[PDB]
């Protein structure tokens, strides 16, 4: 499932703005930039995917987090495709560590879908319609990929662990294992199942997250053919 010229796709990036624990995943540094050893990326993609597989084939949830503008859209696609939750927009504080309270907000979200499907009163004032609807779009913006989470994920997949340090933090306090793609600006030891690759180029964000979702469906019940990628 794994493919090999991801070299055409990413080979990583970032100049000495690096974290030095990431030393082991580096072949050399080129155009004043850290160049990620793909042979290591391989060793890892395997061991990571093995974990991913077992989790799919036991029907266990993955939380997908990415909000850096680059990996932003491709998590709505790729996660819906896996029929799994994600946070696309802002990563609210305490989503895992204070789950039940955050979710108490999704009941509100549902409750608006129900109320605003119609009618059960449109004899409520004009302002209130406006007010309530504005709220509705709101929850929808952050909470959309979140509602699929009815229980604490059995794992979480993150695009930038540095950028999503809070996320990795919340998981570790819960023992929720962490999967992440991570370029050279990252603390490796902080990840359980790790994908040492460029995390800023959508070429790469694409390949890795897709093949992830692919392995997710392929072992879950079915197989599928190409999914959406912006050029």
């Amino acid at each position: 499932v794994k493919e090999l010229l991801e070299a055409g796709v990413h080979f990583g990036h970032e100049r000495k703005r690096w974290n030095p624990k990431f030393a082991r995943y580096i072949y050399a540094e080129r155009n004043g930039i850290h160049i990620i050893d793909l042979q290591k990326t391989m060793e890892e993609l395997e061991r990571t995917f093995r974990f991913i597989e077992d989790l799919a084939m036991r029907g266990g949830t993955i939380l997908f987090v990415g909000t850096k503008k680059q990996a932003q859209d491709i998590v709505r696609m790729e996660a819906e495709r896996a029929g799994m939750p994600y946070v696309n927009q802002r990563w609210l504080g305490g989503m895992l560590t204070n789950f039940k309270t955050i979710s108490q907000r999704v009941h509100r979200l549902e409750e608006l879908e129900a109320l605003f499907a119609s009618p059960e009163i449109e004899e409520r004032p004009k302002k209130e319609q406006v007010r309530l609807k504005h709220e509705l779009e709101r929850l929808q913006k952050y909470l959309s990929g979140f509602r699929l989470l009815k229980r604490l994920p059995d794992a979480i997949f993150v695009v930038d662990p540095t950028k999503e340090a809070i996320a990795v933090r919340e998981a570790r306090k819960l023992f929720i294992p962490v999967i992440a793609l991570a370029d050279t600006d990252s603390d490796p030891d902080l990840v359980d199942y790790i994908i040492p690759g460029n995390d800023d180029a959508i070429r790469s964000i694409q390949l890795i997250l897709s093949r992830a979702v692919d392995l997710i469906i392929q072992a879950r019940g079915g197989v599928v053919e190409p999914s959406p990628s912006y050029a």
Binding site: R169, K173, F175, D189, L190, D192
Partner: protein, 137 residues
């Protein structure tokens, strides 16, 4: 440099605490004999005489526990603790009957005796005492 021995033990502690695979200490047929205890008792994987810039060293291969669950995934140490007892400032010697039981047996006290470098267990076995080099657990 005033204490080659402490220097070694410290080179280790310092390394072990940032989880290096190895660290090299300047070689000594006495330092070796201590590493020959440190590995045998299973505190280190072991050592090998190497060379750095033409100069004799002992590269020492460090050992730890599993990765761990929790927000601090760093593994437990195998050498939790290692510290000089006898020092050049104050030589510390014990008769056999007064060799300490480190950590209720779970750790050792390496000792230079005139029957070579031994552990508490080993010393008590051959029934001799000596300078108490240090303690590990």
């Amino acid at each position: 440099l005033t204490d080659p021995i402490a220097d070694m033990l410290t080179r280790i502690r310092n390394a072990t605490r940032v989880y290096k695979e190895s660290t090299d200490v300047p070689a000594s047929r006495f330092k070796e004999e201590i590493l020959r205890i440190l590995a045998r008792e299973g505190f280190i994987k072991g050592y090998e005489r190497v060379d750095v810039d033409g100069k004799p060293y002992l590269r020492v291969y460090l050992k730890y526990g599993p990765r761990r669950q929790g927000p601090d995934p760093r593994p437990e140490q195998v050498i939790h603790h290692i510290r000089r007892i006898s020092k050049p400032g104050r030589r510390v010697y014990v008769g056999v009957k007064e060799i300490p039981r480190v950590r209720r047996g779970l750790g050792i006290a390496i000792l230079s005796t005139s029957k070579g470098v031994l552990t508490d267990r080993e010393a008590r076995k051959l029934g001799v005492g000596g300078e108490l080099i240090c303690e590990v657990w």
